[PDB]
């Protein structure tokens, strides 16, 4: 996989965005209308639907490709904490897992990089 | 001969400087005891002008250059004057939400800001966005005035400006500038642009270095023509001082391979001078 610009940053985290507050309506509907929200969307208040599930697909996508594209730095950061007790593989998957806390996290509109604040997470993650 | 180089460290790092009786400052910035062949890094040479400001566009008139790549450079022969319109550029990827000053206007050197970034150069803003993304931030240092409409000739963005020429009645112009209007959002201006004059001579000042030897079948002798890597096409974009030219040197000599070393030799007084040795050392056994 390649690495990213930051105007890619810049669109992927504006659809993630998108995403996170779809989710957050979808989790209102879910506490409203006891967990049957698979066929509901306020997206739309029949090519809508396909729509919808156009719009949800392309910005799952785009949390993914931002997911994606940043393994390296885990891999650059993990490489620190080698021999405190977890293995290389374990150090991998849970600054893995804090890299997509970050991802999840990110505020495009602050100017900052995504890099400061995916470091602050995986390190978290890591200790 | 006339050379004069030993230890000096006053501003940074390690600095073999050179004296010479031209009054010219010559320096190598690489290690003393290199490996170099043809086209390379000989010495260099301090500048006391070709300080510039910011980047800028430069297009020559009348001048040849003769080289194939852009990263390799030109071998000059003329000299002429050419441009220079300053112009200074602030390549970054903020978003448009994060701009603070609005654009057509006057802003201050240093006491100013664009996007979270502190300013260089006065003069007027010039901006492009295109996805919502603030791509470059262009501040072109000139004064400004704020008179548009006057039914002349004042429209002159091709040739270039006369201290005796007149573009609108009472307009100051002393120092030669490029003229094109400002498209400011409910503004009137048009904005003057202060063009510096440069120029170089035709082959620097640098004596030719004589040879007490034998030279038989063959001899060294290096000139030192000064490079260009830059074009008509390309514009530089440099936030800071960048320099166009550098007065530096080039050894040639006539696959083949060349591995030459330098050190000091001077048997007259207590000094060291310019030693640049070659010798194909072969081995006979002692045995």
């Given at each position: 996989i390649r690495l990213l610009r930051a105007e890619e940053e810049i669109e992927l985290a504006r659809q993630i965005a998108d995403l996170l507050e779809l989710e957050l309506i979808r989790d209102n509907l879910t506490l409203q209308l006891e967990?049957?929200?698979?066929?509901?969307?306020?997206?739309?208040?029949?090519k809508n639907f396909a729509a919808f599930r156009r719009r949800l697909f392309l910005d799952r996508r785009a949390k993914d490709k931002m997911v994606q594209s940043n393994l390296r730095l885990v891999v650059s950061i993990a490489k620190k904490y080698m021999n405190r007790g977890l293995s290389f593989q374990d150090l991998i998957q849970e600054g893995s897992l804090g890299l997509i806390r970050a991802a999840e996290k990110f505020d495009h509109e602050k100017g900052y990089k995504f890099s400061t604040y995916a470091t602050w997470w995986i390190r978290q993650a890591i200790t | 001969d006339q050379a004069q180089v030993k230890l000096e460290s006053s501003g940074g790092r390690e600095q073999y400087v050179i004296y010479t009786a031209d009054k010219q400052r010559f320096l190598l910035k690489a290690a003393p005891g290199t490996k170099v062949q043809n086209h390379s890094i000989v010495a260099e040479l301090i500048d006391d002008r070709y300080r510039t400001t910011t980047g800028g566009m430069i297009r020559y008139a009348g001048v040849e250059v003769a080289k194939g790549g852009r990263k390799q450079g030109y071998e000059v022969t003329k000299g002429g004057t050419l441009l220079w319109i300053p112009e200074e550029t602030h390549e970054i990827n903020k978003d448009?939400?994060?701009?603070?000053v609005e654009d057509g206007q006057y802003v201050e050197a240093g006491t100013e800001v664009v996007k979270d970034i502190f300013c260089q150069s006065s003069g007027i803003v010039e901006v492009v966005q295109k996805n919502d993304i603030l791509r470059e931030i262009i501040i072109k240092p000139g004064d400004f005035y704020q008179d548009v409409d006057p039914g002349s000739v004042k429209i002159e963005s091709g040739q270039l400006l006369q201290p005796g020429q007149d573009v609108f009645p009472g307009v100051t112009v002393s120092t030669l500038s490029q003229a094109e209007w400002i498209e400011s959002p409910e503004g009137n201006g048009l904005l003057l642009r202060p063009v510096e004059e440069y120029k170089v001579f035709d082959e620097p000042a640098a004596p030719s270095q004589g040879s007490q030897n034998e030279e038989g079948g063959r001899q060294i002798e290096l000139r030192s023509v000064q490079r260009l890597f830059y074009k008509d096409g390309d514009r530089v974009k440099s936030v800071e001082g960048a320099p166009l030219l550098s007065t530096q040197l080039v050894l040639e000599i006539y696959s083949h391979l060349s591995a030459d070393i330098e050190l000091q030799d001077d048997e007259e007084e207590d000094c060291q001078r310019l030693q640049l040795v070659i010798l194909e050392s072969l081995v006979l056994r002692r045995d």
């Open positions: 967990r049957q929200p698979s066929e509901l969307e306020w997206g739309k208040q029949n | 448009i939400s994060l701009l603070i």
